[PDB]
Symmetry: C7
């Protein structure tokens, strides 16, 4: 009897409150080992925890989303998911595709070399990072050329301006020769 209600109930009690003690243990571990600061935004490819950290409590962490809305995340999630910290980034990346008209195949090399030369001389591009311009796709409606480079600023303000300037220069270079980009461009076979 005494054992029947002492050692049996304590098993249900000790197994039904598992999540709360897990949250508190994860909070303690975060206190001892913190992979992020307060004033930086974090990310996770497994769960949606996008936003800037606001407070770190014993049970839950308050995160301010980009909609200016508070988000409360239990601490136990941080012990089982991959946590990404874009706030500690060193450079911002520019990636795009060109997509010529599938008929201007003789201009691919000169366009690629012109784009590479332009990127090599742009003052806003970090020359110590990766810089690739090549035709490597062979799409079903266009000849695609990849662009891969990095900027030296990470403030989300002049990065966009640099990307816009690069895109405009790319358009100008493309239209300097006869490329004029491409569309879906099927055929019809009328009957």
């Amino acid at each position: 009897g005494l054992l029947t209600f002492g050692g049996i109930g304590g098993l249900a009690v000790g197994m039904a409150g598992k999540d709360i003690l897990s949250n508190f243990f994860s909070g303690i571990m975060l206190y001892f080992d913190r992979p992020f600061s307060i004033g930086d935004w974090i990310r996770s490819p497994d769960r949606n925890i996008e936003g800037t950290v606001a407070e770190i409590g014993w049970r839950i962490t308050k995160i301010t989303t980009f909609d200016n809305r508070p988000l409360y995340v239990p601490n136990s999630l941080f012990s089982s998911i991959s946590v990404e910290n874009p706030g500690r980034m060193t450079n911002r990346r520019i990636t795009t595709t060109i997509g010529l008209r599938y008929e201007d195949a003789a201009k691919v090399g000169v366009i690629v070399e012109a784009v590479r030369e332009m990127l090599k001389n742009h003052p806003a591009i970090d020359q110590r990072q990766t810089l690739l311009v090549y035709f490597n796709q062979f799409a079903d409606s266009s000849l695609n050329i990849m662009v891969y480079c990095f900027t030296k600023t990470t403030v989300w303000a002049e990065w966009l301006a640099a990307q816009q300037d690069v895109y405009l220069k790319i358009i100008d270079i493309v239209q300097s020769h006869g490329a004029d980009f491409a569309f879906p461009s099927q055929t019809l076979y009328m009957d």
Copy 2:
């Protein structure tokens, strides 16, 4: 025999009714640590619990959906999912895409500067928040320009009016020059 029979019965009973005790423990924890009030609506990216909180019981929480239907949520969910509280937001966000006609590439800069100037002078826009207008997509059928700003009201009533006014002003600015937006716009190669 008595000890092992009691242990078996207790183990079966405890692991059979884990969910009920979990719900009650979560309700107690909510009573002690409440991340939301009564008269505010909450959200979660993991489960569908959208609606306004009505009552907070020991076992379940009653939430009034936007269809004016009651929704009963077990308390154990709140200890394992991320809870978002839009009712505590400070600003409302306006985001949209323009998408020019891929042929008016010489007007992109002037259109962007005009839209940015108009947004900077709109009385309904919070000037202390993020404000970005840039061409950063380079889509397959249009040249897309992003818009990102915040309003100073959060009442879902004049926020929509301000969004409509901003959209109409954007249309007027776009058609002031020759842009006229864009459509899918493939090609045919008739045969």
Copy 3:
């Protein structure tokens, strides 16, 4: 040997028969705390239990679907999923989108005001609920206007009649000016 043999047997029994005792405990909890009545239909965003409740047993709950087919739901589901009770609703909602032709942008304001005034004077619309008519989308082929209102009846019979009348009045108002709705409406660029 006897003690450990009995413990092994009891542990195996508890492992195998967890679900049945879970169902019975959930049924008991339903008896003590019932979130729904008999003659009302319930819903769940997690599982498919749509239908009207018929009987509530100790193990399973009988639900009559809208195809006039019986559905038997184990009681353990109700302790781990969110349960919605549309049978306790207070109002029925009407939501729709208009989608003008992207060329009649000068009529958007007058159409919106006319629709709002018509909805404000409709005898079947509850004036104490939400009522929003705004242009807030910027779709890829149309200019979309949102409609959001509530009726004062919840009987699925004159709610549909009121919705049909509102839709017909909306069509009449839209065609009073020159809007004539819209289609996908791409472009071709023949060659």
Copy 4:
């Protein structure tokens, strides 16, 4: 040493063989509480167990699919999923959509009333069940009218004949006025 060795062996045995005794306990529960008979077909929205029951054993249940192929289902599934019994249905449902041509908007009311009157006078329709004919969709390429009624037979043979007769009468009624249904019907804007 003997006690702990026996405990280890028993725990391993209980952990490994949970599913078999779970199946047997589920079969015993089915024997005591059977939600279906032998000569009726069952369904489940969670798993694929479609078919007609053939035999109910202690471990597995044999179900004859509609391809005349035997299907063996473990008994433990029936204690954790929702089981639907269409073999106990009282009526068969007819549901369809009309989809007018978006230009015959003045005929919607008369078409709806004609269809409703025809359904009310059809000898094969159960007049005590739900009967709704309304225009409630407002689709992107057609004006859709919903049809919702029940038949008094459940034999899968006269139900199909009644459905075909109803569809033919609907076609005749629709073409009596000028509706002629609708197609995707986009626009082109040639250039």
Copy 5:
């Protein structure tokens, strides 16, 4: 110390080695209760175990796929998934859809009766099984007629020949009157 150390070691061993002993227990249960033979092919709607059984071991079962490649399946799967045995089928099913031109609505009845009469007199069709031919779909681009019948052979060789003959006869019957099937068949509305 010795007792608790032995208990810890045994708990670790039992938790780590659950799957192997589960596989052997499932193999033993298969030996005692076998739902399939060697020279027949099995199927499962839950997992991909398609193929013909070759050997049944204590731990794994070897199955020869239809690509003439060996497949090894652990025995524990058969105790938790539904197993289908097409090798024990009694008949093979023929199902197809016709899809008329949506303009020949006056020929639907005569076409249906002709197809039904043809199927009723075909020597390769089992007359004691289900036989249904009805117009029951009302598709968006065609008027669809369902066909449902069974053959008296199950050898995958003359079943295909009978299906081909039935399809050719259906084509001949359909083209005897003016139906000529149908295509997507949208509309364009030039501008």
Copy 6:
């Protein structure tokens, strides 16, 4: 106190380190019972373990993918997933679809018989395996004919050459009569 403290510590250790000892037990089982050799490539429909086996360790198995990149797979996966061994295959399969023009329905039989006769006389086709050529699809834009045969070689080099030769012969046979294959081929209905 000592006994319960030791039991708690041991239970925590056993619960935390389950995966490592599971991997080692799976490796021991693989050593005792190996379903594959070193120099053959394996496959699994459950997880992505495509590649050729290189080494079999106590904890993990090293597999060389077809990109010439090493892949390390924990041993515990092999005790819970189905493992397919294409390296032990006896024949390679050729499967394809023809898809005539839906207007040449009178040539289906002669085309099928010609293709079957050609396959029956091809020196690279195994005559003791399955060989089926039938019209069994009735697609929405074409009349599809299935092809199913096996080759006597499994070297991935002569198999491709035989497949190419068979495809070219099929094209020649198809164009010998008037078939000319088919395209999507909708209709437009101008307005």
Copy 7:
């Protein structure tokens, strides 16, 4: 009382803190048995851990993504997922599809032989690896030819240059005869 209280508390602690001790055990195992080094990038088909390893701690591993952002991965993941190490690759693979115009079927053999001969004599292609050029797809709008080869460099800089050169040579060879690639190319059946 003391014994059962301590047992319940220890069971709760062990059930709550499983993840942290699992992470530390996985870190220790990584220290003893590591499948990767610091200065190489790893991959996993199960989870998103793409990037280059930076630091290996006791609890978490720091990985630098290709966006120059830090990523923190718990150590327990590496004991349950497949880890791929592209940094230890020996060759880089080139794969592409040609897709002729469905009317130039008489040139397939000569085009295939020309492409194979060109690949056989390219100085940047490893002749000891797989090299396949065959027509094996028979697509719905084109006759597709597969290309499969390997390069002798693995530094991502001249690999792209070699791929671009190969693609340009393929284009030149294809246009040497009359192929001119292909488009979707449906038919219209005007009415």
